[PDB]
């Protein structure tokens, strides 16, 4: 006899609330939900390949690149990061990291884990990196790779990018940029800013379900990875394998792992939506919304964490915890009474901030309202 | 001006054929497709946690275990493998591997990559492992971990399991079993067979979309992993992190990575279906079908790769390439003329075999027919 019996809770039907305006993930639009409900096809079929090919073109379009080594990572944001680090870095190599919030911190941990030379340019939450703080580190530590967070979703900071690609190439270094938060909602041009490795997530402004990520590599990166003398520590993430499967190199596509088919359908659609909308219209939408939101938020009497408006990330706003409140009470209130998700801090910003998120189709004046009135109420009833 | 323009192909609407009876993935039933079409919820919400908790109970039920360290890996079959290896093996450690087809071979590559002592018990395609070939290796190489493929989908072989858990524990070793193919479609009892690490995939007999996997750890494994002195090479796959998030350990759930929400909805449902159906009824269904199929296949005049019926994997049948044919012609024919996917070999079995798959709700007499008549036709028209 079987000792473990059919779980009582599973024999009920699944049902989910109706809720998201935090740092992510974001709500899905009809078209993407529709894609997610479709039947499976052969995971190595002519049809599946065509879908992948369209996804690649879409990643080129949203990154603004023509890099032939552009493909989807079967896994979340951290997965894409770990993939870029584990294929570009042979143990010991020098690694320069912009540690201005949790997303540098994580790149640190990953770098350390794979045995790299880890030099963390540490900076309080709110801070960003000047060309000179960059040169200072490029000079003192002479790294083969630098990591910068573009949209720092844990501190609400937009990192300036122009010119750093070039600063890296003078010091022979490679530029890796995390655009999970920013991609789709602020200007970003891979080739025109000399970024070597650019990655993003499906779940932020693209409004896809979490679990896929986008990645692209320049030919300087492609060269470093293909002329490695060690094998990378992960098979799942071995780029030479992935590239082949994704049609990037010359050979016929050889099975590696099984791609998340139904998530790909979703991703494709999220790309078609933003391809139809167009990037500059997207960046406008996000910019305007962020401004509207900032205005209403100061109207409630709150103080924005990032003082300088040019340094604010449109997709994710940080707001200082108003004195005399418990941030958890406010957050609780908003979901408990209005069915709306916002978030507190994260990593360094923990307990310092509240975070509010405008991502893709969910970055509207309408939603800003809803969240404004939710915060009003919480400020009236959450104990002071 | 933006140099990369909106991709022409994306601005058309997505559409997919209607097709799957290969080694996997498998077709989805309505209920799972429905789940895949649902809206997002907060990825760290009380509701999301409850769903995860039900998924855990379901993994306990299908593995037959009460191991509190049981959870879902955000990633495919290889991801789950790499996760078990990267958390259980400190560099150098001795690693005994059942290399009887591609799935041992991959565990080899992964083991080598993370710097383990890799001893591959190599065996031609079709072969399985006796308790004595196991003891011989346990004795000569004295490993801390042994890997066995349960359902060898690349050779159609069901590996016997009874007693090997115990053989391992006498040599102090840990038993890791790959049940991606077999889980749901043949008998398997984690605790009653003394397996230390058991993993499976969402996409085989559970009929979920590819991109999630199941994993469970015994307390001997849990102890080895938690008392490591090196950190594991992957952050994404660090078990101490995952365990916490998945509610396994004592602490409140701390954000690690973002779980594939919508895939989880799907997984939950695939588990509820088999929980309602019950395992022994599932194993019956699969067993019967496999027998029906074997009969019809010899009727067409074909010769089954695995001679001994007790060693045949119900979920995946291997059939010898009939002399004078091009296996690619046959496979092509079947999809091209009937909208049915089957597969050729893989790894060692490449070009030797054809593979036919009966997985979950798609393991029916009905589908066996359809594929039988497809093969008939291909044998009449595919050039000899
Ligand atoms: C959301 C986000 C991440 C997290 O990605 P996961 O899906 O949690 O792996 C990382 N970096 C940035 C900038 C983000 O906005
Ligand atoms: C399908 C299958 C795999 C492959 O899993 P991926 O999703 O390709 O990572 C591995 N092992 C076995 C036994 C299988 O049946």
Residue numbers in the entry:
A (entry chain A), B (entry chain A): 5 to 23, 25 to 389
What does the report in the manuscript say about this coordinate set?
D183N is a pathogenic variant of AGT that causes Primary Hyperoxaluria Type I (PH1), a severe disorder of glyoxylate metabolism. Although the mutation is conservative, the variant shows a 2.3 × 104 fold reduction of the catalytic efficiency, whereas the affinity for PLP is almost unchanged. This effect is also a consequence of the strain relaxation, which increases the stability of the protonated species. The strain release of the D183N mutant is also likely responsible for the slight increase in thermal stability observed for this variant, and for its apparent resistance towards radiation damage, given that the internal aldimine of the mutant seems not to undergo x-ray induced-reduction both at acidic and alkaline pH.
AGT is a hepatocyte-specific PLP dependent enzyme, belonging to the Fold Type I family, catalysing the transamination reaction between L-alanine and glyoxylate to produce glycine and pyruvate, thus leading to the removal of glyoxylate. AGT normally localises in the peroxisomes and failure of its detoxification role leads to increased levels of oxalate, coming from oxidation of glyoxylate, causing calcium oxalate precipitation in the kidney and urinary tract. Many pathogenic variants of AGT cause PH1 (primary hyperoxaluria type I), a rare autosomal recessive disorder.
